[PDB]
Each structure stands twice: as structure tokens, then as C-alpha cells.
Subunit: 163 residues, 3 copies
């Protein structure tokens, strides 16, 4: 619970073949790799990682009640917005295709300090994040969320990676 991961580009491409909403893993504008938080949900043998995303203007219109997102901010400093967990684009993973961020070897950077500020807030809210993940998947499967990842198709296809 509450660990940062990166995901192999080839696994991302494999999943993208079946669902184009799977998060982008390559972009020349990315300063660091796409970080995921996990494991946000473990259900029916599937382990899910959810992508982190930096602030965007439309994040202002996100209601806390939406399980598609978990808004992040510094513990006790709500004005210090730290992006959000984009649960609506979480994906099931093969453990061979994911790797923990090597925080204790990464050099001291503004990004690493932000990662730790995010981590404290996530750890304190782990149960809320898992509840939102479970609810979001459940509603999306029933067609009661719009434009999330295709959890049925991803759960049907992901284990055929490399096979």
C-alpha cells in the first residue's frame, strides 16, 4: 500500500493496443517517468496501479465525491495542491513489468521532496483511496462511470503479455 512505481513501456504499449485510454508512458515533455501509486486495489487476483498527474485547470471542477479521482495536497496545507491520483485510468499489472521507484537512492531534488509530501498524504488516506478504487471499478463495469479505462478488457487481456 502507498508505494511509487514505474511501468515498463512495452507492457504499456501492449495494454494500449486493447484500450487507448491506458496512460501515456512516452512524451518528450516528461521530465521524469510517469509515476504510479499502488497497490490501490486487489480484486479477483488483479493488482491495480493508478497514475499520478500534475495540476490542470479542469482539476478545479473535480468534486471530492467522484471516485474517478483522488485529489492530493500537502498534509494540513490544502492550498499546496499536489495533483491527483487519476483512478479512472488505473490498470492491472504483471509484477515483472513494474518496478518500485528507488527513493532511497534517488538524488535530492524538488521532485523527490514533492514525492514525499504526496506520500504522507496518500499513506494517511490509503483506505479512502482503496474505497474509491473499488467503487470506481464497480461503477465503470456497470457503465455508470464515463470514459474510464476498459477494466473488463484489460483484465481479460493483460495476462497474455509475453505469451
Amino acid at each position: 500500500m502507498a508505494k511509487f512505481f514505474t511501468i515498463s513501456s512495452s507492457y504499456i504499449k501492449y495494454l494500449k493496443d486493447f484500450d487507448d485510454k491506458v496512460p501515456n508512458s512516452e512524451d518528450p515533455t516528461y521530465n521524469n517517468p510517469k509515476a504510479f501509486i499502488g497497490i490501490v486495489l486487489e480484486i479477483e487476483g488483479h493488482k491495480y496501479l493508478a497514475p499520478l498527474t500534475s495540476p490542470k485547470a479542469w482539476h478545479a471542477n473535480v468534486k471530492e465525491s467522484s471516485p474517478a479521482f483522488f485529489k492530493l495536497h500537502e498534509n494540513g496545507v490544502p492550498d499546496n495542491q499536489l495533483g491527483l491520483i487519476n483512478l479512472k485510468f488505473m490498470i492491472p499489472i504483471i509484477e515483472a513489468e513494474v518496478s518500485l521507484l528507488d527513493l532511497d537512492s534517488m538524488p535530492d531534488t524538488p521532485y523527490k521532496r514533492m514525492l514525499y509530501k504526496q506520500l504522507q498524504f496518500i499513506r494517511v488516506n490509503e483506505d479512502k483511496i482503496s474505497e474509491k478504487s473499488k467503487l470506481l471499478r464497480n461503477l465503470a463495469l456497470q457503465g455508470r462511470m464515463q470514459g474510464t479505462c476498459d477494466f473488463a478488457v484489460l483484465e481479460e487481456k493483460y495476462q497474455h503479455f509475453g505469451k
Copy 2:
């Protein structure tokens, strides 16, 4: 719980014959009929409605611990005092002799807006109001309350109205 009612004048007079502390229900001074809130208590098959009453000076001396009263005020605006529920003068009712207020059809008036501000506070505290009503009846029957309605005689006599 937390609904506004009016009570037939004949039922009120019937009960008043057995207990003169039964609330006055009609008066030319009334801008609106005497409103009751209910059902505040259901015990031994008897359903109780409690009268609302507008501010009086002596209400300032009412302590929260007294189950004879439930002071009302606007949610989050304690200085906007809205009278009280006079639990000590609650009465058991016959369903045929009471009527819901027709809120969804009543014309919009300042009185109706006040009713809604009262209703919100009552809804939020419905459990407390019910606890106070039960406690008040229990203490009054043991003779440990001051000048309440005579719940024993009222429960003995009320069902024989019209029979």
C-alpha cells in the same frame, strides 16, 4: 421523523377535558395554526406530537439538559433563535385527527421559510429530540418533572375520542 402537523380542534378540546395543560390550539391572535412536530415518540402503541412555540423571555433560562424542551435555532447560526419544541406538552394522537402541513403546496411566505429553517435543525437533531421525549415522559410518569401534561390519563383516555 421531523414532520409538521396540525391537530383537529375537537380532539384538542377532548384531551383538554382530561388535562388542561394540553396545548391551546385555536386563537384569533394566531397568524398561522398551532404547528406540531412529530412523531417525536412511539411507545406502547401511542404516537406523540409535540407543539412548537415562539420565543418567550423565560426561554433564556432553559438549560440543554432539560428534556421538557428542545430549543430551536438556525443550523450554524445560534443567534437566530427559532423558539422551541415544548416537549412537556406533547400529546398522543389519533391518526384521523391530525394532518400534515401541506408544505409542497403552501404559498411561499416568510413563515414557510422559517418552517424550513426549523425543519433542518430538527432533522439534524431528531434522535436527540426523541431521546428527550422518552426521558421526559418517563420522568413525568414517576412525578419527577414539573407541570407537564398528564401522560397517564391522556394515554388512558385519548383512544375513546368519538366512540
Copy 3:
């Protein structure tokens, strides 16, 4: 629980024969006898009383997590420090050798006013004090606390007092 006691000087000196850290009980400079609070711990048939002690400079360096002490202050007035319960020098007692303070009949003095402020703060924290007492004894017996009373020796020896 949460009662003030004095302990007979002979019992104190008897225990001091086996453990020199047992609190000094009389000193010509003392305005009042050394007051104890109890019963803070009841374990394996032993009843424990803990000495109260007035402020010392080093009390500023005491951390709340230490079960060796329970700092006292006026309820809701943290700046009004009232010394501490020195649990690390608590002792098992023989009931015949302890006496309640005569709070009912003692004349009103500033010391008695302070005693009552201490009593309120202790009463509100009774469970916390008992937890600290049990933990401190447990850790001291394992050598995980420093310079407390010798609870093993005191519990072995206290009952042969007077025989």
C-alpha cells in the same frame, strides 16, 4: 483511583533499607508531607502509590512518551504547571501504613487549592496514568528504563514490614 495519600515514615524507611531511590518522605524544609497519588497500579496483588513532586528545571526536558513521569497542569491552562507524578519512584504499599489526605476537613489553604486542581487533572487522565504505571514497571523490570525504583526487590521485601 485518583486519591491523595501519605505513607507512614516507618514504612518509607523500611523500604529505603532495600532501595535508596524510594522517595524521601520528610525533610525539615517540607511545608507539607510528601503527597502520593494512588492507586496508580494494581498488579500481582501489589498496590502502587506514586509520589508527587514540584517543578524542577529538568522537568522541561521530559517527553510525554516517557512512562517514568506524568506531568501535571491545570485543566485547560497548560502554562500552569503543577509538578508531575514521578512514577519511576512509585512503591507498593501496605494499606495499614498509608492514610488518605483529609481533604474533607483540612482547612482551606493555597496548597489545598493546588491539590484540587491536580486532582481534577489526574481524574481526567486516570486511565493514561494507569497505563503509564503498568508500562513503566514492565520496562523497568526488563532493564529498559533507567534509575527507577527496584520494583522486584520492593515487591519481594515490602510484605515483611513489622515482622
